[PDB]
């Protein structure tokens, strides 16, 4: 009987009892994936 196969990430978000940083507000924006219109490209199914 062959063994199974899977994957996982060893890294994880550390949960501290108290954070020094106030973290009043956060941001997350990049140039990539801007999506100006996404109409120039043409896609269709194999049918």
Swiss-Prot record:
Q: What happens when the gene is disrupted?
A: Severe alopecia during the first week postbirth, correlating with hair fragility, alterations in follicular histology, and apoptosis in matrix cells.
Q: Where in the cell is it found?
A: Cytoplasm
Cross-link Glycyl lysine isopeptide (Lys-Gly) (interchain with G-Cter in SUMO2): where in chain: 13, 15, 34
Q: Where's the Glycyl lysine isopeptide (Lys-Gly) (interchain with G-Cter in SUMO1) crosslink? A: 13, 15, 34
Q: Where is this region: Tail?
A: 7-47
Induction line: Induced in damaged or stressed epidermis and by interferon-gamma. Up-regulated by LEF1.
Function statement = Type I keratin involved in the formation and maintenance of various skin appendages, specifically in determining shape and orientation of hair. Required for the correct growth of hair follicles, in particular for the persistence of the anagen (growth) state. Modulates the function of TNF-alpha in the specific context of hair cycling. Regulates protein synthesis and epithelial cell growth through binding to the adapter protein SFN and by stimulating Akt/mTOR pathway. Involved in tissue repair.
Q: How is the subunit organization of this protein annotated in UniProt? A: Heterodimer of a type I and a type II keratin. KRT17 associates with KRT6 isomers (KRT6A or KRT6B). Interacts with TRADD and SFN.
- Spell out the family assignment given in the record's similarity comment: Belongs to the intermediate filament family.
Protein name as catalogued: Keratin, type I cytoskeletal 17
Organism of derivation: Mus musculus (Mouse)
| Organism phylogeny | Eukaryota, Metazoa, Chordata, Craniata, Vertebrata
The gene it comes from is: Krt17
Q: Which stretch of the full sequence is covered here?
A: 390 to 433 of 433
């Amino acid at each position: 009987g062959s063994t199974g196969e899977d994957a996982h990430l060893t890294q994880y978000k550390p949960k501290e009892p108290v954070t020094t940083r106030q973290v009043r507000t956060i941001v997350e924006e990049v140039q990539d994936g801007k999506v100006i219109s996404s109409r120039e490209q043409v896609h269709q199914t194999t049918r």
